């Protein structure tokens, strides 16, 4: 299990403000694990290095949250062929 804080069933609630920083705090045990940020139903948020930053000890850092980031978000990682999930619910 790669994530530090397990949220499999019930998501953690993150309060977000229009236009300000939003951290999806899915930090991981070793910096070498690839992590993917999904937004239900279909979205994938790729870290581009400035608007969206991946920091393995922090989670995903999104620098200017919009309405597109309201809802159910999921960090995904595959370790040894197993998919692990942590769910967050952003609310404004």
């Amino acid at each position: 299990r790669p994530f530090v804080e397990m949220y499999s069933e019930i998501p953690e609630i993150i309060h977000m403000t229009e236009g300000r920083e939003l951290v999806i705090p899915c930090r991981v045990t070793s910096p070498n694990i690839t992590v993917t940020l999904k937004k239900f139903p279909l979205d994938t948020l790729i870290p581009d290095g400035k608007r969206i930053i991946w920091d393995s000890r922090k989670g995903f850092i999104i620098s200017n949250a919009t309405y597109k980031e309201i809802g159910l978000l999921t960090c995904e990682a595959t370790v040894n062929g197993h998919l692990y999930k942590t769910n967050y619910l952003t609310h404004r």
Partner: peptide, 13 residues
Amino acid sequence: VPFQEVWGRSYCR
């Protein structure tokens, strides 16, 4: 009914 199923069924469809 589990929460994510609840969420998913009423989200935007």
